Amino acid sequence: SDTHIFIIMGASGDLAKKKIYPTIWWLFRDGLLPENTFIVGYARSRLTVADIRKQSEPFFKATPEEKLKLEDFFARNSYVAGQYDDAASYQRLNSHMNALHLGSQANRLFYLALPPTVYEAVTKNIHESCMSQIGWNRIIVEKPFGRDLQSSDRLSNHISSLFREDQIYRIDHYLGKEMVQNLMVLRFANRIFGPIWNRDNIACVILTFKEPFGTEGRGGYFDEFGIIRDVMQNHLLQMLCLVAMEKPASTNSDDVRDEKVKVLKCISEVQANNVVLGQYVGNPDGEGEATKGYLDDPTVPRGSTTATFAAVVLYVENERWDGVPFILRCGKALNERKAEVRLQFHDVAGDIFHQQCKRNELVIRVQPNEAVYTKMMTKKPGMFFNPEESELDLTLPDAYERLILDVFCGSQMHFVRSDELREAWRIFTPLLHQIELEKPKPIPYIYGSRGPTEADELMKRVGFQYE
Amino acid sequence: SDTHIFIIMGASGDLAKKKIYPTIWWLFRDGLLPENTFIVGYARSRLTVADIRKQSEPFFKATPEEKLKLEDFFARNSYVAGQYDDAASYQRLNSHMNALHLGSQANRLFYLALPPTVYEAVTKNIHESCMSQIGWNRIIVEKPFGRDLQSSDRLSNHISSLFREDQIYRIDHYLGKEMVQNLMVLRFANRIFGPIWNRDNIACVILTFKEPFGTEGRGGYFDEFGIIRDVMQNHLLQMLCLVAMEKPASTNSDDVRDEKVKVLKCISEVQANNVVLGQYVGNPDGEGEATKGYLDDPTVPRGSTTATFAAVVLYVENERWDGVPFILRCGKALNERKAEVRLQFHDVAGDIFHQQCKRNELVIRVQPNEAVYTKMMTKKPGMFFNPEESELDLTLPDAYERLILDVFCGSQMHFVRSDELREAWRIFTPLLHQIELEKPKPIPYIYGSRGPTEADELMKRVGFQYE
Amino acid sequence: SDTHIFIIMGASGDLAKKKIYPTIWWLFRDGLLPENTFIVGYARSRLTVADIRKQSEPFFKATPEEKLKLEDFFARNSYVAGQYDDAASYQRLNSHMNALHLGSQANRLFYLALPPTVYEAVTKNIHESCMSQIGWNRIIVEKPFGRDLQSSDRLSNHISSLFREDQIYRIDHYLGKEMVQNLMVLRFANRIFGPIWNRDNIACVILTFKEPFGTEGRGGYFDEFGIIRDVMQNHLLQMLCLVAMEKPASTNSDDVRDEKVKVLKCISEVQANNVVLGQYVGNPDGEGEATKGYLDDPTVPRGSTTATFAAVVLYVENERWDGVPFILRCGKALNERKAEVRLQFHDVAGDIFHQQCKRNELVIRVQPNEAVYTKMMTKKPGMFFNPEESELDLTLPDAYERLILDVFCGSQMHFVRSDELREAWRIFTPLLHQIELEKPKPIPYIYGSRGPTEADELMKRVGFQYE
Amino acid sequence: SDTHIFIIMGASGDLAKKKIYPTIWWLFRDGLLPENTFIVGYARSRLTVADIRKQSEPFFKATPEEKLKLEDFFARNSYVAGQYDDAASYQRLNSHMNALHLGSQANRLFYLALPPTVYEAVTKNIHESCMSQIGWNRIIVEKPFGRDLQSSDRLSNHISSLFREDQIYRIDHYLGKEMVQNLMVLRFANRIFGPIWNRDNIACVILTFKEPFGTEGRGGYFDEFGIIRDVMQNHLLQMLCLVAMEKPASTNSDDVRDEKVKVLKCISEVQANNVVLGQYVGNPDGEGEATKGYLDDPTVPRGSTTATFAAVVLYVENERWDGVPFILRCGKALNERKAEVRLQFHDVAGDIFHQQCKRNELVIRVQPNEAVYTKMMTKKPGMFFNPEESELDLTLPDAYERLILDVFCGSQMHFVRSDELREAWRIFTPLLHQIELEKPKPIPYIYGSRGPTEADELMKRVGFQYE
């Protein structure tokens, strides 16, 4: 009902032209955005709505059946050209927004789709210039959230001195939000999985994020950060919080993020003896990009110690998870594209089936195909007592569209908080400093393989049983 | 490899010609019996193998493809005519076995398919004359096992003074042996269902055995015993033992029957305030037998207070099942054929889903259409935290063939023991004495219904939350 | 070192001269305060240090041995005469504080011991002038913290707009801090009482606070608040939070108050059917004040429905405490002085001792005679299996001295938080509004009795088994 | 009434005159024996009541006050001289017993206090001649119950072919029967110790039986058996059964021995890698027998590897005790006399006390100075959250008198059964056969020390945390 404005900061950027504009396109096409919604593209380069349309339509996946809808979408679009650290551009932007249908009363939604080196300046100018005095104001902040505990604290302190937590929306591109809700309903609305969700029954927790592609083209951008900062400290650790949390007081966003930050407070700093780092190398038997390793990219500096694979074992030190390993295994250039939560349960206390029993498993897969199945054992049909391992299944805008829909709706549950981010960086900062100080050489693994075998050895050591 | 003999006592009886000969037919046809197996029918009236063929073939369900195999099977059988209480006849039958290929060294298997009023004489004569000195001897005792604690005690004392527990096989026609193994493997090989199998999680247990037909023709025989002795005293109580048993020390038959009798030893005597007794009456809407009531059968004595339906709540007072109701609901002429084990779980402690969750259920249906499925809630596809109830499935000679194969193989796990049988009557004897002493009037219910609503009121009172 | 200043707001009040001067005197006498500490009294009446001496010496309970040390303590005292709502008075008080040894660098602590209506002006004036620019500043706020959710929210919002939670110290005079630490260590450092601290084992929780004396003198002031607001809203509910809290992430003050707030957030509003209200009436026999009832006090308004006793059942609707009653029983003019936490455990699952077992209890008595004892069953010596009830013991400035020491050391664990207080008032606000709207008549009970019988009936109804 | 006869088989032996006659003295002196109790000594040497008096009075420990009652006890006694393998002597004994006041109607109770090589003939002669046709018959059998599985099965099969389990009373001199009942009431009547009695909480179980003296003169008798067959196979393993048993269906003896044998069936055979065997050596610094080693005894054969100390770790592979070690530590000539049960509990999940908490323990000391106490952490009084470990106590004929009283009363709970003994010998037979075949050398330890250090290393290896 209320009129809204979708503000794309740095709309000329690659991310804005490939993932955000198509994602508001698909959201307006499906009728999910509020009826009165305006898109204002703001960047440094002087462009028009026609230029943005021309440069973004290939990624729109447009069809001839909806050219009228496409024209309606682009009639709601607007562009303002200005520097990110020049105030005059910001009051020009604010005057443009006020020069709209109920622009002053409109709810303003900022998306910061620009390099993080200017987040300070952009947030400083937005607070003084482009706020709305009637409707709410919300900024979407993209990763990276700094690289250390100190930098993350300084950016978070700046933003929280300007905004409040109700206005900060730190987005996580890899959070499905549907399998997360499946997790919460499964382990919180069912008594089957309630009492068994603790130390006494679960042996280990494996949180996986594999990508079959390396760092083609954009290897220099990945070099400065590494796979830990890329995936593990934010996405896999948020999945750890969702898996290991206590039952919240309610399904409110704050009541869930409190449980997540409480789980984070129980995790101690990472020790390097529980970390296996890998770096993919070219495959001689490959066909395309498989024949080029991480160091083969001309944008990667020579002798780069950046790891494209990492397996890290964490321990949530509370009553429910003390001593249970949490193996965060993520890496690039692996054999498949997988992202799942895997729980191995303990062997049954007292075996009457002559060591034929296997550990029960509960897998919550997000990528490529969503599934929730339990690998438990049922009796093999016949005339004889032996269990057999059987896979039993227990289970549409994608993750990004629904995340933007949460930002519109104000559901901040699936976004990392400030204290949550501080604990997430506290867990990993000493290990990252040690890695970037000593520069230990990562274990090379072949492109398309399963990663270094030392990661498998570490998983064996911590108490993981693989068939 | 070793030769076997299958002795059918009372082969001229209805039970033999209707259930036994087809069952051994299906066991021999499927190539499951030992190759050297002899069948020796014995009854009072003078018959031959040809007479048995003429009276039995329509119930064989044979096909023209296997008429040669049928001829081979009937060239293997034999008949002996003699009284059940004459030593000379038993000596003749023993000689008849001795006049067979390796007959003296054969394993002898006696099935008691004759009225229980003469078991006292028949077992005595069998022990006196027909016993085997080399091969094992096994007798299969058909229900009824007496009418109360005293009659069952005297019969069991006689049989155990003659034979040992390794030789007694008290058969349960309604026991699947397929879903029982599924139960044991499900709850004993899986940690998913291990910790939750107790008071803290399971709210109530429903053990159901319904039949869509009444007591046509043979209602007079049912009159003297009633539905309690007919189904509930033995079959439903064995199912209760299998559900409530502790994990045995091994998969041995004795190690399982010890747990069964231990479970029976902690069930108090049945009180009349936990029992709902009903009698099916005609459904004037008719259709067939439905328009004839229990008392409308001329074979039933006038003014018969025999209950064709019974709902009884039992409490296994031990550390695992204290306070958890065990509702045995069995009846005749009900709405459908069903035999299932249903476990309601408690509501989740602390509801963050606005009273939308329902009690989880684990259902182990024995017949028809064997299945093991849990009613647990998944996330409703959509946009919000909405739980919806979903049925998730977790799952070949019939039961009688697999039970006769148990007697052949010596597996005595699914047969009731003497101490187990004595505990079964100590739980039901006071109630039955009260019923046939005071002679209460059962609540009449229409043919084809779900039973008297007083049973539903009883289940609701004891803690069964029916949605 | 690090010189301190202890500013006692309201130096002429009864609370000051009767409890605060003795407490700080005992703190210095025991050598517990920092060596450099100054006590600056401030009130409206023109007084001196000698007037403070003459008005407060009866209550120091001093001895002639330490009269020199008493003189030393009074040599560190001072008085400032100024109105509570005069800016010049606070300016001269700030100048007086600066006119001390290392005064500007001193840590300032203001004890607000003045009537509730004046906090609004006093906090504002203190924040305007009397703040310290170098050392820390802390305020100690005496109850009442408003009369309902609205008044408490107003006062808390004012104070939080002025001060931060690190500076607000809401004092609870009834909180032992010695048996509370014993409770936390007992239930968090021991595996004996760890697993059993949940629904599955605990039947009901009784939190008790009884006084043997009535409302002599201070009767009209008690009239406007009632026993609920006086004791149950703050002290008994904090005891409930301590009993029902999960294990905090650490022993830090914030980590404990977070668990306390999470416990409070899981408690629904109090219903009038779970409340029993009593009002003590004069015991005809008596000896003294027992002859005088609540309305017999001339200062109590006629026809007062104020309850001097209250029994309230609370339910913490979370995973650990769903369905477990929390019976808060507080009252005045009862049979004995008592303040204890009593935990009844369930009956043992399966009784093999012929119903001779009583429910196990864990009692943590705070006053009188601080003790921790559990009532479990031990075998009666002899030749028989006859268990018998046995009491087994499981277990220094007073509570107020250690509470002021907490404010000096900054240990804010034992002080209620703004959100904690908001939740506490949210729980009780509808019930109190109904009480002072409908004006129910409390059940009159004899002075020196155990309270109205309806409280015992309520405990019996909710599941309390009294031997 | 119901006249009783106490037959001491082999009354001329050391065991009778040193332990049994004083025990019946103390039983009749305290008025615990039935009033019509006759004592009949029977052995080879031609003796009289006066001679038994002369040889046994020094061990009677009587007083001149009760010297009058002494004759009354000796006025009920009688003696028969006969060989143990002569039917004429046993017929004479039967006639002598029949030549008593209501001797034919009397209850006959035989004590077998004669060498085990003669038991086979003695039991046969008793069953042939001396059995009672009216009252009950009970035989008390002394250890050893054979040397291994084969001999024990032979003896038990012989006795069971002669007598039934209601007549066989296998005595255990070291079973207190007083602290065992305390343990049962503690863990079965209380929920404080109920849910914590499993894998999830208990880390290890230590079963101790120490003696400060070595083989004094009877080293030759101990040489053929060893400390395993001496104490560990029978007494410590019965303690293991009592600790690890599930809650019986009742307090009946049969229901308890059923659980004991069920626990025994869940114990795998002992492996030599979980066994530490020791042999004590003389201590130069000693004064008396401490200076003489095991091999220094002339009655001990030269080059004897008989173990006088043994530390053995067992595992009860069932649902409640999977992976929990059961360390049986017994030895002779140790530092102190002790026989206790110690249960170490796991570390609390999540330490908020900075690695200060120690594992909770529950100690049930049987001898000396019977006591039950828990070592659990309570807060150290002061100004800090630091717990301290404290010992909190949870707590008359001696053990042998109460055991004979159990035999008289028919309480068979504390006597080992046939199948119990079968499982007990099955557990230890492979290890003992390996010991007697390979003949390993035990680790020498100093007389009066704590035992070999390898035992401590084994306890630390299996999971025992020593402070």
Swiss-Prot record, chains A, B, C, D:
Keywords linked to the UniProt accession: Acetylation, Carbohydrate metabolism, Cytoplasm, Disease variant, Glucose metabolism, Hereditary hemolytic anemia, Hydroxylation, Membrane, NADP, Oxidoreductase, Phosphoprotein
Gene Ontology CC, one term: intracellular membrane-bounded organelle
Domain of life: Eukaryota
Main localization category: cytoplasm
Mutagenesis or variant effect for residue 156 to F: In Dindori; class II; 5% of activity
BP GO annotations: cellular response to oxidative stress; cholesterol biosynthetic process; erythrocyte maturation; glucose 6-phosphate metabolic process; glucose metabolic process; glutathione metabolic process; lipid metabolic process; NADP metabolic process
Binding-site residues, NADP(+) 1: 10-17, 44, 119, 143
Result of changing residue 263 to M: In CNSHA1; Viangchan/Jammu; class II
NCBIfam families assigned: zwf
Name of protein: Glucose-6-phosphate 1-dehydrogenase
Organism: Homo sapiens (Human)
Classification of source organism: Eukaryota, Metazoa, Chordata, Craniata, Vertebrata
Gene: G6PD
